[PDB]
Design an enzyme around this catalytic site. Structure first.
Site, mmCIF file in Angstrom:
data_model
loop_
_atom_site.group_PDB
_atom_site.id
_atom_site.type_symbol
_atom_site.label_atom_id
_atom_site.label_comp_id
_atom_site.label_asym_id
_atom_site.label_seq_id
_atom_site.Cartn_x
_atom_site.Cartn_y
_atom_site.Cartn_z
ATOM 1 N N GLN A 171 45.541 -8.402 92.625
ATOM 2 C CA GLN A 171 46.723 -8.328 93.468
ATOM 3 C C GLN A 171 46.337 -8.670 94.914
ATOM 4 O O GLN A 171 46.910 -9.582 95.525
ATOM 5 C CB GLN A 171 47.325 -6.921 93.384
ATOM 6 C CG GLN A 171 48.736 -6.795 93.935
ATOM 7 C CD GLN A 171 49.317 -5.394 93.771
ATOM 8 O OE1 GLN A 171 50.501 -5.178 94.011
ATOM 9 N NE2 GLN A 171 48.484 -4.438 93.362
ATOM 10 N N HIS A 175 47.484 -12.253 96.877
ATOM 11 C CA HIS A 175 48.506 -12.179 97.907
ATOM 12 C C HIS A 175 48.026 -12.737 99.235
ATOM 13 O O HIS A 175 48.613 -12.481 100.288
ATOM 14 C CB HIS A 175 48.991 -10.752 98.059
ATOM 15 C CG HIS A 175 49.879 -10.319 96.942
ATOM 16 N ND1 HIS A 175 49.556 -10.532 95.619
ATOM 17 C CD2 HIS A 175 51.101 -9.739 96.946
ATOM 18 C CE1 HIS A 175 50.545 -10.106 94.854
ATOM 19 N NE2 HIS A 175 51.494 -9.621 95.635
ATOM 20 N N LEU A 352 52.602 -18.154 86.939
ATOM 21 C CA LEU A 352 51.518 -17.819 86.021
ATOM 22 C C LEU A 352 50.733 -16.571 86.404
ATOM 23 O O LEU A 352 50.344 -15.795 85.539
ATOM 24 C CB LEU A 352 50.560 -19.011 85.905
ATOM 25 C CG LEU A 352 49.345 -18.939 84.975
ATOM 26 C CD1 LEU A 352 48.829 -20.352 84.731
ATOM 27 C CD2 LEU A 352 48.256 -18.066 85.578
ATOM 28 N N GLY A 494 45.737 -21.866 83.663
ATOM 29 C CA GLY A 494 45.259 -21.119 84.814
ATOM 30 C C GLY A 494 43.921 -21.568 85.371
ATOM 31 O O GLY A 494 43.735 -21.618 86.588
ATOM 32 N N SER A 498 42.836 -22.167 89.362
ATOM 33 C CA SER A 498 41.836 -21.274 89.930
ATOM 34 C C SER A 498 40.617 -21.981 90.466
ATOM 35 O O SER A 498 40.346 -21.923 91.665
ATOM 36 C CB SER A 498 41.403 -20.245 88.898
ATOM 37 O OG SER A 498 42.533 -19.505 88.478
HETATM 38 C C1 HEM Z 1 51.962 -1.279 91.933
HETATM 39 C C2 HEM Z 1 52.185 -2.389 90.918
HETATM 40 C C3 HEM Z 1 52.939 -3.637 91.417
HETATM 41 C C4 HEM Z 1 54.182 -3.642 92.045
HETATM 42 C C5 HEM Z 1 55.113 -2.444 92.412
HETATM 43 C C6 HEM Z 1 54.457 -5.032 92.304
HETATM 44 C C7 HEM Z 1 55.613 -5.462 92.923
HETATM 45 C C8 HEM Z 1 55.941 -6.750 93.221
HETATM 46 C C9 HEM Z 1 57.173 -7.130 93.888
HETATM 47 C C10 HEM Z 1 58.290 -6.179 94.353
HETATM 48 C C11 HEM Z 1 57.145 -8.482 94.029
HETATM 49 C C12 HEM Z 1 58.222 -9.376 94.683
HETATM 50 C C13 HEM Z 1 59.524 -9.271 93.860
HETATM 51 C C14 HEM Z 1 60.729 -10.068 94.369
HETATM 52 O O1 HEM Z 1 60.639 -10.769 95.418
HETATM 53 O O2 HEM Z 1 61.794 -9.979 93.699
HETATM 54 C C15 HEM Z 1 55.869 -8.913 93.438
HETATM 55 C C16 HEM Z 1 55.420 -10.214 93.386
HETATM 56 C C17 HEM Z 1 54.210 -10.651 92.836
HETATM 57 N N1 HEM Z 1 53.279 -9.824 92.240
HETATM 58 FE FE1 HEM Z 1 53.395 -7.865 92.033
HETATM 59 N N2 HEM Z 1 53.444 -5.903 91.875
HETATM 60 C C18 HEM Z 1 52.499 -5.040 91.326
HETATM 61 C C19 HEM Z 1 51.306 -5.471 90.770
HETATM 62 C C20 HEM Z 1 50.879 -6.795 90.688
HETATM 63 C C21 HEM Z 1 49.608 -7.208 90.099
HETATM 64 C C22 HEM Z 1 48.554 -6.269 89.477
HETATM 65 C C23 HEM Z 1 49.563 -8.551 90.215
HETATM 66 C C24 HEM Z 1 48.466 -9.461 89.643
HETATM 67 C C25 HEM Z 1 47.532 -10.152 90.614
HETATM 68 C C26 HEM Z 1 50.801 -8.971 90.884
HETATM 69 C C27 HEM Z 1 51.123 -10.282 91.207
HETATM 70 C C28 HEM Z 1 52.272 -10.685 91.848
HETATM 71 C C29 HEM Z 1 52.565 -12.074 92.215
HETATM 72 C C30 HEM Z 1 51.680 -13.299 91.962
HETATM 73 C C31 HEM Z 1 53.783 -12.022 92.841
HETATM 74 C C32 HEM Z 1 54.574 -13.166 93.464
HETATM 75 C C33 HEM Z 1 54.155 -13.398 94.925
HETATM 76 C C34 HEM Z 1 55.043 -14.316 95.736
HETATM 77 O O3 HEM Z 1 55.696 -15.216 95.159
HETATM 78 O O4 HEM Z 1 55.084 -14.153 96.986
HETATM 79 N N3 HEM Z 1 51.608 -7.884 91.161
HETATM 80 N N4 HEM Z 1 55.149 -7.844 92.936
HETATM 81 C C1 FL2 Z 2 37.164 -23.224 83.411
HETATM 82 O O1 FL2 Z 2 37.468 -22.834 82.055
HETATM 83 C C2 FL2 Z 2 37.314 -21.557 81.618
HETATM 84 O O2 FL2 Z 2 37.591 -21.231 80.412
HETATM 85 C C3 FL2 Z 2 36.817 -20.313 82.402
HETATM 86 C C4 FL2 Z 2 35.521 -20.415 83.241
HETATM 87 C C5 FL2 Z 2 38.030 -19.786 83.219
HETATM 88 C C6 FL2 Z 2 38.322 -20.144 84.615
HETATM 89 C C7 FL2 Z 2 39.483 -19.592 85.296
HETATM 90 C C8 FL2 Z 2 40.372 -18.659 84.560
HETATM 91 C C9 FL2 Z 2 41.592 -18.053 85.221
HETATM 92 C C10 FL2 Z 2 42.930 -18.171 84.589
HETATM 93 C C11 FL2 Z 2 44.071 -17.582 85.252
HETATM 94 C C12 FL2 Z 2 43.921 -16.898 86.492
HETATM 95 C C13 FL2 Z 2 42.628 -16.771 87.117
HETATM 96 C C14 FL2 Z 2 41.455 -17.349 86.483
HETATM 97 C C15 FL2 Z 2 40.005 -18.362 83.178
HETATM 98 F F1 FL2 Z 2 40.760 -17.525 82.437
HETATM 99 C C16 FL2 Z 2 38.884 -18.895 82.521
#
Ligand code: HEM
Ligand code: FL2
Ligand code: HEM
Ligand code: BOG
Ligand code: BOG
Ligand code: BOG
Ligand code: FL2
Ligand code: NAG
Ligand code: NAG
Ligand code: NAG
Ligand code: NAG
Ligand code: NAG
Ligand code: NAG
Ligand code: NAG
Ligand code: NAG
Ligand code: NAG
Ligand code: NAG
Lengths: 551, 551
Positions: A171, A175, A352, A494, A498
């Site tokens: 997370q 972000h 994703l 992904g 990445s």
């Molecule tokens: C305490 C647990 C979590 C809460 C409450 C939470 C909450 C949220 C909220 C409220 C949003 C924006 C929703 C909207 O605009 O409608 C969001 C976006 C997002 N969250 Fe979470 N989240 C949590 C955990 C995670 C985790 C573990 C990840 C994985 C890395 C994650 C990845 C994302 C991503 C990629 C976005 C979109 C970001 C963007 O477009 O700016 N979140 N989350």
């Molecule tokens: C590069 O190919 C691979 O199989 C390995 C090293 C690899 C690399 C990157 C990811 C990955 C996928 C989604 C979000 C963050 C990391 C993953 F899941 C596997």
């Protein structure tokens, strides 16, 4: 009917409208020719006939531990890490191509860094169906789709042993480059930088960074609480933080990312990295007494970026992949390749990366078991327990499996609904079109997609056609590999984003990857030997159990 | 004293401070080792000893027309062009390194597009002399230096036959990427984009571009006068333009580059290009009747970027170089190479490109001989004569020799004085240091620099030491190649900056360089076959004598 709605061009050929009703595919350098870029050149044919299934290679990388041990200790390790780095990278267009405004190459799309880029253009606004040509005139109700297939019934821990220390790292880390602008609308971002620039630490803008900086020894501002170092208060670091109305400035913590105050897990890393930055400044000043505040600060930033990439590849990704092959972070592996050291975040990569299933039913800290209501806007849990404690707890609590479906806690399910709705605003192409764009055969049916028959039948009823299945639901409902955290698509789609994002950083370029860039051999080794353990324990009083894996 | 003031590190090695008095050279990938990176590797040694001088290669490239013709008709042309493109380019760091604030790599310098980059770190502020270690405690008065060796006495025409048409093209062309900000001060630019993005046509910011666009058929706004097409007035295109106070809005033209109203020569090109844009639009529309304004506008823009690069390499530089080898613009030449498709403008490149000696004593348009006070802000000359008229004029009038000295008209001599003053502000390292950074041995005496005795003797008295001679002064006082427009330094130091900027453009990358990007084969051919003659004549009522060489 718009011919491009049929997605006629294969193998990355570009569909171009001509006249009033004609279409034409630009098959330049795709390895194929013919109206739709499907007639292969002998070499292209050799390559695709010899390539093993993405599922078979996974097999080779997850078996024969003994085999990989000799391999990992020889130059063969390198040869493979490079093979991986380049083949995975060539799937991401660099320079970037399209964005929410242009489904075609343009100078605006190339220079306008406020836009998110996209790998596949959108579904032309004038197609028979929302997905192009297949499916019903109307897509399933996002909320319904979520409740029925993504809502958690019974917590399903990740079979690979991933804990919450990993979840929150994910997370925190993401972000820094995923910051959608609410004011501008989907498709737009504030995380200019488009990568690991550590903006969630120093800020996505200068005036903000200046407000966070101490301007002494190149350090970041901070405060002492219970004898420990924590981020400064907004009263001391006059920066905008998203906190519930009513919380006074003196009670808020300033960190770089405006949203990090809304989670102890987030502020945890905020604290760890802040401490790390100031620590590097010390080591530096020792080596370079003639250095001012700027060079100390700038140099320390570069080193931290390096640590970050180092740990993401050799531990983060290592945990995720579960490969017996030991991934390696060494920019030099690409010095003999044709590689563009730049990167632009894609909306598809954003979608994703919504790994909310990782979150638990509740957060256990020692004998205590906190609920979401007690955990979310908690203004003191971080300081109450201190860094070490929260790290030991998160490191011991398993995170949920990401793929397979029905594993998102109801407390946050709304995010998934919004992720789906946004997808339709962005008009993301269908999942099968993305399967192809990333070297995979499209699914011929839902049962094929879901290793089972029950959800497959319902999904079939709702969507009508497998080809109408949307990007995100597909990633989250795909059948998972044996004991994996998710399916192959999450890996095959992904990985390219990445790795391109990690290696497409200028510090990985021959021009930057020099000891002098990091203030000498000392700064260069901090990057080269970075560890999650060292990141925590070298900034904490006591060293707890720290890992992306549960004990 | 600060050891780095001795520029101890050779062959691009990086000087780094350690302790209060020690230093250390980072020789990584320099081809050398040892304290100062002086110990040549085996291959480095061969290259440097078996490399003919720039003077000798220039000889080969300007003699034996017969052999070159036979060569220009073989694959060898591509081989040499590619060699020229890569070897020359590798001298420019990409990603960029330092800027006016950081004499070291940093994330701010890599990200902050509002800065000009620099190839050599500044002269450390705490050095014994202004230039480091040599010369006097005080540099020669910029005004005197300018009046003594740069002020024109008798107009000296450029032997290569260069005309004013070339002169104004250079100004117009460069002012798209040289736009120093007065508000921010030296070291800062407003020409984000940093290259051939045509910001001098579409503006350097979006809101400005919008006011300039018609939003119909992807065209640019325009007005009619005497049955001819001219840029709009500031009344129809509410865009900022620098014009003397007292000039009504109906008389001010809007062009994207805020400074072009200051010269019919500039406004002429602004007109020609504006006319070419709408023309390309009409062509695109015919081929794509379903496209809208945005896509039409964007595609036209890309085509014009391509045309500009085509004309610059194959005609502009061909003329400058004087080479018998036929230079060639074709991105495919680099597809097999390791090369970054990005580019950042250097302050040294800015200094070097101050070619004011090109301007004449006066401007001859037919029988009338307009003076500087009659030309400078004339808002009605362009319309009075029309494009054909002025193009014919400027094409027939010789521009002055850029090198040799004493050849800048008093009317604009203040510009050189200011370049010198800014150089000192930017703390540009000494000329000999730049010679080394670009593969040349330093001059051992002023008499060796200028192929004569008088000026040399005086410069010797003023600077005291050849090693104190400044950048700009040196470029303009260096003896010229045989009958060339300037000295080797201008070529050997300017070629890398130029070509890197042309070829390091995203449209030259394998990803963008496809017919689809330019609207199809029709668009692509407009790029592949662009000419200065077609740029003009395909947009004027009558085709005059158009060329970069005098008749
Ligand atoms: C305490 C647990 C979590 C809460 C409450 C939470 C909450 C949220 C909220 C409220 C949003 C924006 C929703 C909207 O605009 O409608 C969001 C976006 C997002 N969250 Fe979470 N989240 C949590 C955990 C995670 C985790 C573990 C990840 C994985 C890395 C994650 C990845 C994302 C991503 C990629 C976005 C979109 C970001 C963007 O477009 O700016 N979140 N989350
Ligand atoms: C590069 O190919 C691979 O199989 C390995 C090293 C690899 C690399 C990157 C990811 C990955 C996928 C989604 C979000 C963050 C990391 C993953 F899941 C596997
Ligand atoms: C018509 C005669 C010309 C006049 C009156 C003129 C005038 C000027 C002026 C007033 C400045 C800004 C000076 C300052 O801020 O102190 C300038 C800058 C410059 N001129 Fe000219 N110029 C002329 C011709 C040329 C030509 C032929 C070239 C060759 C390409 C040229 C290249 C430049 C460059 C590179 C700069 C600096 C760019 C920047 O920092 O923004 N000029 N000129
Ligand atoms: C043990 C050998 C490991 C080789 C690592 C290669 C890196 C994986 O590369 C990936 O393989 C997939 C399967 O065919 C393809 O579908 C993807 O397009 C490709 O990027
Ligand atoms: C067989 C051919 C031998 C050629 C001998 C060339 C030797 C160059 O020698 C080098 O010259 C530099 C500058 O003077 C010194 O700084 C280096 O320390 C020295 O090794
Ligand atoms: C006749 C063959 C001509 C080939 C053109 C090569 C391009 C010129 O290249 C230049 O030559 C200079 C002289 O040694 C070097 O100092 C420069 O570093 C190099 O870029
Ligand atoms: C690349 O080496 C060369 O001799 C040729 C092709 C060449 C290329 C570019 C320039 C050049 C130098 C200064 C400003 C604009 C162009 C030049 F003067 C010569
Ligand atoms: C423009 C075009 O060629 N599209 C057709 C589609 O309409 C038809 O239903 C299909 C049958 O397989 O073949 C394809
Ligand atoms: C040679 C070839 O494969 N032609 C096909 C055509 O039959 C099909 O109807 C159309 C739409 O997908 O795409 C193309
Ligand atoms: C977009 C951006 O951050 N630009 C900054 C500018 O705000 C700052 O004043 C200048 C001086 O450091 O450097 C640059
Ligand atoms: C040269 C320049 O523009 N730098 C600015 C500075 O003047 C301003 O006070 C600061 C605060 O945001 O940001 C930066
Ligand atoms: C819901 C809430 O904000 N209150 C809790 C409080 O009951 C708990 O004892 C403390 C421990 O960190 O965290 C906070
Ligand atoms: C720090 C250092 O070693 N610099 C020396 C300098 O003091 C000396 O005068 C010069 C003589 O050539 O050589 C160099
Ligand atoms: C072998 C060698 O090059 N050593 C020189 C040393 O003699 C000189 O004093 C110093 C500073 O110029 O740079 C280095
Ligand atoms: C710096 C810049 O030009 N960014 C522009 C932004 O101003 C505009 O509002 C947005 C929508 O098209 O596209 C982008
Ligand atoms: C979504 C966004 O920010 N785009 C803006 C638009 O709203 C504004 O009217 C235009 C004029 O500058 O620039 C762009
Ligand atoms: C001060 C001034 O610019 N006036 C001139 C005028 O004398 C000349 O006859 C006309 C034609 O080019 O252009 C204008």
């Amino acid at each position: 009917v718009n011919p491009c709605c049929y997605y006629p061009c294969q193998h990355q050929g570009i569909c171009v409208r001509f006249g009033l009703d004609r279409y034409q595919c630009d098959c330049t350098r795709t390895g194929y020719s013919g109206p739709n870029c499907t007639i292969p050149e002998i070499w292209t044919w050799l390559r695709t006939t010899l390539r093993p299934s993405p599922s078979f290679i996974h097999f080779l990388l997850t078996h024969g531990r003994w085999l990989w041990d000799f391999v990992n200790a020889t130059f063969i390790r390198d040869t493979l890490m490079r093979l991986v780095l380049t083949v995975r990278s060539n799937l991401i267009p660099s320079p970037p191509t399209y964005n929410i405004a242009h489904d075609y190459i343009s100078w605006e799309s190339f220079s306008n860094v406020s836009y998110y880029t996209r790998i596949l253009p959108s579904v032309p606004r004038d197609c028979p169906t929302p997905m192009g040509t297949k499916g019903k005139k109307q897509l399933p109700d996002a909320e319904f789709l979520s409740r029925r297939f993504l809502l958690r019934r019974k917590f399903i821990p990740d079979p690979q042993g991933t804990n919450l220390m990993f979840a929150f790292f994910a997370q925190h880390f993401t972000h820094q480059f995923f910051k959608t602008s609410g004011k501008m609308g989907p498709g737009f971002t504030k995380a200019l930088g488009h990568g690991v620039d550590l903006g969630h630490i120093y800020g996505d803008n200068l005036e903000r960074q200046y407000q966070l900086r101490l301007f002494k020894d190149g350090k970041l501002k901070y405060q002492m609480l219970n004898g420990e170092v924590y981020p400064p208060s907004v009263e001391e670091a006059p920066v905008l933080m998203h906190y519930p109305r009513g919380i006074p400035p003196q009670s808020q913590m300033a960190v770089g990312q405006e949203v990090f105050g809304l989670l102890p897990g987030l502020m945890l890393y905020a604290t760890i990295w802040l401490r790390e930055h100031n620590r590097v400044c010390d080591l530096l000043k020792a080596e370079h007494p003639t250095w001012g505040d700027e060079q100390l600060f700038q140099t320390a930033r570069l080193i931290l970026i390096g640590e970050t990439i180092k740990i993401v590849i050799e531990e983060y990704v290592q945990q995720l992949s579960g490969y017996f092959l030991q991934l390696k972070f060494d920019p030099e592996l690409l010095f003999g390749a044709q590689f563009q050291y730049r990167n632009r975040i894609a909306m598809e990569f954003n979608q994703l990366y919504h790994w909310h299933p990782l979150m638990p039913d509740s957060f256990r800290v020692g004998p205590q078991d906190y609920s979401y209501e007690q955990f979310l806007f908690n203004t003191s849990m971080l300081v109450d327990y201190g860094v070490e404690a929260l790290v030991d707890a998160f490191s011991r609590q398993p995170a949920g499996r990401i793929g397979g479906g029905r594993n998102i806690d109801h407390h946050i399910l709304h995010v998934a609904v919004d992720v789906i709705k946004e997808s339709r605003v962005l008009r993301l192409q269908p999942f099968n079109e993305y399967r192809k764009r990333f070297g995979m055969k499209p699914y011929t049916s839902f049962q094929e997609l879901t290793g089972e028959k029950e959800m497959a039948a319902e999904l079939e009823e709702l969507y009508g056609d497998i080809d109408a299945l949307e990007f995100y639901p597909g990633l989250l409902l795909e059948k998972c590999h044996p004991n994996s955290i998710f399916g192959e698509s999450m890996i095959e789609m992904g990985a390219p984003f990445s790795l391109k994002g990690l290696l497409g950083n200028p510090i990985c370029s021959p021009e930057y990857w020099k000891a002098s860039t990091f203030g000498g051999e000392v700064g260069f080794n901090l990057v080269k030997t970075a560890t999650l353990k060292k990141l925590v324990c070298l900034n904490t009083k006591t060293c707890p159990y720290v890992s992306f894996h549960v004990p």
